[PDB]
Write an enzyme that holds these catalytic residues in place. Sequence first.
Site, PDB file in Angstrom:
ATOM      1  N   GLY A  87      28.174  53.191  45.926  1.00  0.00           N
ATOM      2  CA  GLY A  87      28.438  52.006  45.129  1.00  0.00           C
ATOM      3  C   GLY A  87      28.946  50.849  45.964  1.00  0.00           C
ATOM      4  N   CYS A 107      42.554  45.004  40.689  1.00  0.00           N
ATOM      5  CA  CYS A 107      42.352  44.029  41.750  1.00  0.00           C
ATOM      6  C   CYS A 107      43.383  42.890  41.791  1.00  0.00           C
ATOM      7  CB  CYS A 107      40.925  43.454  41.659  1.00  0.00           C
ATOM      8  SG  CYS A 107      40.274  43.104  39.984  1.00  0.00           S
ATOM      9  N   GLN A 159      39.671  34.284  39.891  1.00  0.00           N
ATOM     10  CA  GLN A 159      39.031  35.523  40.279  1.00  0.00           C
ATOM     11  C   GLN A 159      37.587  35.443  40.719  1.00  0.00           C
ATOM     12  OE1 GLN A 159      40.390  39.228  38.262  1.00  0.00           O
ATOM     13  NE2 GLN A 159      41.615  37.869  36.951  1.00  0.00           N
ATOM     14  N   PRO A 189      19.540  10.120  50.953  1.00  0.00           N
ATOM     15  CA  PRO A 189      20.945   9.733  50.928  1.00  0.00           C
ATOM     16  C   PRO A 189      21.245   8.566  49.999  1.00  0.00           C
ATOM     17  CG  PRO A 189      19.944   8.715  52.757  1.00  0.00           C
ATOM     18  CD  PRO A 189      18.904   9.657  52.199  1.00  0.00           C
ATOM     19  N   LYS A 239      46.731  44.000  31.992  1.00  0.00           N
ATOM     20  CA  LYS A 239      46.918  44.963  33.085  1.00  0.00           C
ATOM     21  C   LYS A 239      48.023  44.456  34.030  1.00  0.00           C
ATOM     22  CE  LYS A 239      41.825  45.808  33.204  1.00  0.00           C
ATOM     23  NZ  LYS A 239      40.638  45.956  34.100  1.00  0.00           N
ATOM     24  N   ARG A 287      37.705  33.343  35.791  1.00  0.00           N
ATOM     25  CA  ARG A 287      36.696  33.669  36.768  1.00  0.00           C
ATOM     26  C   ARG A 287      36.165  32.362  37.317  1.00  0.00           C
ATOM     27  NH1 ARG A 287      34.907  39.162  36.019  1.00  0.00           N
ATOM     28  NH2 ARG A 287      36.421  39.386  37.734  1.00  0.00           N
ATOM     29  N   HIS A 336      40.273  37.161  45.199  1.00  0.00           N
ATOM     30  CA  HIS A 336      40.979  36.632  44.043  1.00  0.00           C
ATOM     31  C   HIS A 336      42.057  35.702  44.546  1.00  0.00           C
ATOM     32  CE1 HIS A 336      38.798  39.408  41.735  1.00  0.00           C
ATOM     33  NE2 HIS A 336      39.686  40.379  41.606  1.00  0.00           N
ATOM     34  N   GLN A 340      39.482  41.169  47.167  1.00  0.00           N
ATOM     35  CA  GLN A 340      39.565  42.131  46.082  1.00  0.00           C
ATOM     36  C   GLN A 340      38.905  43.470  46.329  1.00  0.00           C
ATOM     37  OE1 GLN A 340      36.186  43.507  43.696  1.00  0.00           O
ATOM     38  NE2 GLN A 340      38.309  43.425  42.973  1.00  0.00           N
TER      39      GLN A 340
END
Length: 369
Positions: free
Chosen positions: A10, A134, A161, A192, A243, A267, A274, A350
Amino acid sequence: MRVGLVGWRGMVGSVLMQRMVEERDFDLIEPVFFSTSQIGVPAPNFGKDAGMLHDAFDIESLKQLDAVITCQGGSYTEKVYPALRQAGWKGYWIDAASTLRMDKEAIITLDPVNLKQILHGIHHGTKTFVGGNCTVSLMLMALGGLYERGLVEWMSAMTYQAASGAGAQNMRELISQMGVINDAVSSELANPASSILDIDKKVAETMRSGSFPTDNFGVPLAGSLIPWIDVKRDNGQSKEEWKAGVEANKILGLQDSPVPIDGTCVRIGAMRCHSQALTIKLKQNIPLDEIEEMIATHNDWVKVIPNERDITARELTPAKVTGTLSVPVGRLRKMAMGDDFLNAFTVGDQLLWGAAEPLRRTLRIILAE
């Protein structure tokens, strides 16, 4: 010692291996690798030969392991962890998933911070160790000095995060979105002299066009932000903003007398770091001169960054930190509201401290015993 690794292919599982290879963790253990997709095939060789892959769902196969470090996630732990215990397994279970974090029989690992709490459990049974969320563990890896000394009355956290937190797929979406946004005004940028507001207009339509890659996030992340992470709870918090308290205190071992911690978890389009902006409410007006020392001294990874403009720009950003185990913390100053009001901004990878590192370290510990 027979240690099985699960969910090792993973995203987290991978950082886990890279680091185990780097710290030579594979030199003190007989590794056994686990998969769910094609048992029997040869196993990876990071240095040593580890035979073939074993059935990660085979309770009988696992029973012969002293240790299990799984980054396979909750859905896995929920089925196999139970099955394994009731089948009389007394071995060590090193998990990354949040599943057992709040279980009585489990110790949330973050030694730099709570080595004490870990060793007690080691000698006194405790075979189930889970890594922390995390956000929390990176927070503690920075404010470790203050907290360990109960110097904090309460803390308010507004986070930034990274997408890595959501999963590998989300990181991909983030960069695809960034791509899709450049693609929309690619040429105009070249000239430009184009119309700035026209460039904007398009960019906005694009992120807005249903064809904007939002299968994993639901809404655009790149060029925006999402003021909500995880499921909504009874009170107003999200499980992410929750948490924070519960897990933080558990580590600090102070549940019947817990430090108040709340804030908004957002996020932002960062890859794997993070970032947090904390309103730290101390109990006794302490000189900043001393807050820095307590902080700086807590562990070998936290790095205090002089509250000076230019250097803060180089040093305290997802840009600088990403990939490193360094945990910068800066913008340290007393606030407009009293000298017992300390401002602090911290950045942290993280995937390392916020997920994989604690696991491998925990192993080395349980070994040194």
